[PDB]
Design a protein around this ligand. Structure first.
Ligand SMILES: Nc1ncnc2c1ncn2[C@@H]1O[C@H](COP(=O)(O)OP(=O)(O)O)[C@@H](O)[C@H]1O
Lengths: 182, 57
C-alpha cells in the first residue's frame, strides 16, 4: 500500500518521470552521463565528477558524454543505476524510492536478463514497494484510446511495429530494426 | 454426354467442398487458434481478465 506510484519511461534519448494522474511528465532529461574532461586548478570551481540533465546541458563543453544504453540494451549498469538515483534527487521528483511504487516501460523483444537485473536494482538498491514492467506499444494505444491497432514506434534507440488486438500484442507479428534516430 | 458432364461437376464440387469446409465452415465453428495465433495461457487469463476489462474500458 502507498500514496501514488511514480511512472519512469526508460527512453534511449530522454528519461520522462512523473506521478500517475499527471497530464505531462514533469521531469524530462537526456539519458547520458557527462564527466568533466579538463583539469580543476582554481578553488570554488564546479564540484562533482558527474553531471546529469540541465547541469550537463548548461556546461556541456566541459563534459564528455557517454550513453549507458544503446538500442534499448544497458551496456554500463553502474551509470544506468546512478541515473535512476538522480531520478529521486532534489532536482527531479524529490521523493523516497522505498515510499512510492515504480512503473518502468521497456522496449519489445528485449533479453530476459535485462528485466532480471533491472528488477534487482529497484528491489535491492531502492527497496521499492512494487515494480511493474510494461510494453511501449500497449501503453501508446491506451493513451490514444484504441484497444486494437498497429503501433509504429520509431524511437531514438530502436524502431518497432507491434500489431495489438483488444490490448494483446501478437508476439509473432512484432518487427523491430536497430536503425533509429541516433 | 449431358449425364457425364453433370455427374463430373457434381463429384468435383463435393471434392472442392471437403477442402472448403476445412478452411471455412469447419474452422468457422471452432478455430484451431485464436486470432492472435497463440495458445491460451490459462495462468495469464486468470490475472489478465481483470487487467484487460479496466484497460480496454
Ligand atoms: N523535432 C524532431 N524532428 C526529428 N527527430 C526528432 C525531433 N525531436 C526529437 N527527435 C528524435 O527523436 C529522439 C527522441 O526519441 P525518444 O523520446 O527517446 O523515444 P523513446 O523514449 O520512445 O525511445 C531524439 O533523440 C531525436 O533523435
Amino acid at each position: 500500500i502507498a500514496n501514488q506510484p511514480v511512472v519512469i519511461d526508460n527512453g534511449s534519448g530522454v528519461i520522462k518521470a512523473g506521478f500517475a494522474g499527471d497530464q505531462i511528465p514533469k521531469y524530462c532529461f537526456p539519458n547520458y552521463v557527462g564527466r568533466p574532461k579538463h583539469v580543476r586548478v582554481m578553488a570554488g570551481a564546479l564540484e562533482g565528477d558527474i553531471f546529469i540533465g540541465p547541469k550537463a546541458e548548461e556546461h556541456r563543453g566541459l563534459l564528455s558524454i557517454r550513453y549507458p544504453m544503446e538500442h534499448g540494451i544497458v551496456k554500463d549498469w553502474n551509470d544506468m543505476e546512478r541515473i535512476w538515483q538522480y531520478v529521486y534527487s532534489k532536482d527531479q521528483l524529490q521523493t523516497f524510492s522505498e515510499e512510492h511504487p515504480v512503473l518502468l516501460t521497456e522496449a519489445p523483444l528485449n533479453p530476459r536478463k535485462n528485466r532480471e537485473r533491472a528488477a534487482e536494482v529497484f528491489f535491492e538498491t531502492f527497496n521499492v514497494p512494487a515494480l511493474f514492467i510494461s510494453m511501449q506499444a500497449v501503453l501508446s494505444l491506451y493513451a490514444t484510446g484504441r484497444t486494437t491497432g498497429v503501433v509504429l514506434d520509431s524511437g531514438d534507440g530502436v524502431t518497432h511495429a507491434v500489431p495489438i488486438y483488444e490490448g494483446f500484442a501478437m508476439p509473432h507479428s512484432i518487427m523491430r530494426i536497430d536503425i533509429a534516430g541516433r | 454426354k449431358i449425364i457425364e458432364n453433370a455427374e463430373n461437376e457434381y463429384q468435383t464440387a463435393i471434392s472442392e467442398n471437403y477442402q472448403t469446409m476445412s478452411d471455412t465452415t469447419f474452422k468457422a465453428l471452432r478455430r484451431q487458434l485464436p486470432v492472435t495465433r497463440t495458445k491460451i495461457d490459462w495462468n495469464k487469463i486468470l490475472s489478465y481478465k481483470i487487467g484487460k476489462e479496466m484497460q480496454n474500458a
